[PDB]
From a paper:
In Gram-negative bacteria, the type 2 secretion system ([name]) is composed of a pseudopilus assembly platform in the inner membrane and a secretin complex in the outer membrane. [name] has at least two T2SSs, with the ancestral nanomachine having a secretin complex composed of [name]. The [name] containing [name] is responsible for the secretion of at least 19 substrates, most of them hydrolases ranging from proteases to hemolytic lipases that are critical for pathogenesis. In the [name] secretins, each subunit consists of four N domains followed by the highly conserved secretin domain (Pfam PF00263), followed by an S domain.
After analysis of 18,000+ particles, class averages revealed that [name] is a pentadecameric secretin complex with no other symmetries observed in the two-dimensional (2D) class averages. At 3.6-Å resolution, the secretin complex was found to have 15-fold symmetry throughout the membrane-embedded region and through most of the domains in the periplasm. At 3.6-Å resolution, individual α-helices and β-strands were resolved throughout the upper part of the secretin structure and within the N3 domain, and the majority of the protein could be visualized. There is a relatively unstructured linker or hinge between the N3 and N2 domains (corresponding to residues 239 to 246 in the mature form of [name]), where the resolution of the structure starts to decline. Less well resolved density was present for the N1 domains, and no density for the N0 domains could be observed. The failure to identify these N domains raises the prospect that this region of the secretin complex, proximal to XcpP in the inner membrane, is not arranged in a uniform 15-fold symmetry. The disposition of the S domain in the [name] complex structure is equivalent to that of the other pilotin-dependent secretins. Structural comparisons with the Klebsiella-type secretin complex revealed a striking structural homology despite the differences in their sequence characteristics. We propose that a pseudo-6-fold symmetry exists in the proximal region of the N domains. The flexibility with which the features pack in order to transition from 15-fold to pseudo-6-fold symmetry provides insight into the mechanism for substrate entry into the [name], with the substrate-XcpP interactions competing for the [name]-XcpP interactions in order to gain entry into the [name] chamber; success in this competition would see the substrate be secreted via pseudopilus movements.
Residue numbers in the entry:
A (entry chain H): 337 to 440, 454 to 480
B (entry chain G): 433 to 440, 454 to 576
C (entry chain H): 529 to 593, 604 to 613
D (entry chain G): 337 to 384
Write the structure that this text describes.
Amino acid sequence: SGDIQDAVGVQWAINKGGMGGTKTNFANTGLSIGTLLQSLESNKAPESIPDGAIVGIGSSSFGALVTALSANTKSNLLSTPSLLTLDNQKAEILVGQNVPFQTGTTVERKDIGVSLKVTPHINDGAALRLE
Amino acid sequence: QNVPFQTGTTVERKDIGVSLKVTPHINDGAALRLEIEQEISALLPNAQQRNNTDLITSKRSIKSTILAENGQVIVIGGLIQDDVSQAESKVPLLGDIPLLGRLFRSTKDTHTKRNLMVFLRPTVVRDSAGL
Amino acid sequence: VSQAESKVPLLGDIPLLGRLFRSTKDTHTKRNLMVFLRPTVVRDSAGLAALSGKKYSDIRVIDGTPTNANQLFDG
Amino acid sequence: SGDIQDAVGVQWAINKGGMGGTKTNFANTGLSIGTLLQSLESNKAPES
């Protein structure tokens, strides 16, 4: 398995005069300019809620926030159960936990983990059948 | 141990620990038949959810039917589970440079092996001398 | 493969400063999966002994990798 | 059985001027720079 994100955004906070402020709020990647001007009041009392690799170039009102992240996860699983059996004999291997689950509260036990159930049928020679 | 488990509260008793249930079928000579139901349970204090005892009631549970020879150490079952996983998180321009790439990224690696064999050994005694 | 954008509709289009206005989010994802099977027919105890000896040596070598020297049994 | 983790991360907190602060928050391995600048206020009262 594998996946790769790539999140990157430039935000502009030119509050040059007037009621308003020509801020380019992009509520896409984590932080935003609206919560940044509320984060001014966070820097007053609480100083709360960061997200992402942030870079803030500002003259403290004339702002520009660049937010970026790049997750990159890989994974590689392998499993090899193996058992001996006769024909027409339901073998089984079960490895790993046994958990409850609600059917209401009227819970019930149920097995979780690697598992295998073979049933062969064996000719006198080649070409076995497996279920 | 012997533990309770909820079936609702309408709890019930249930056995936890190493266990073995054999049923043979014996020819006058070699090549005995065995109906094995072997298991190894456990009980888990670590990973507890918002619910009851996460009873590992099977950790191995091989319920097979084999046909063995009276002095032969044989193999009934197995599991070979290999794993390797790795996540990263970096600034997308600076982690790539293979001179300072350690100084920006954040890695998490996880390798995991579980090897497991279940062997069996039958010995036929019919006179009291061998017993 | 998935990719979302969010831009000012006039300024993100210009392929010189288009990075300085948009906001992108890309997501690539692969999952490869195979399930293989291997049957071996044994009908005499000789081949069963051979399989048992191979698996027992292959677990002895895992014992061969404190964590002091592990033990054989009455084979 | 056996397993081995390996977790390692470098975090940069260059707050050179301006509203903001060019901190590289990686919420991957335990602590982070955001909870470190809140840990300044922890070092004030709780130290948690």
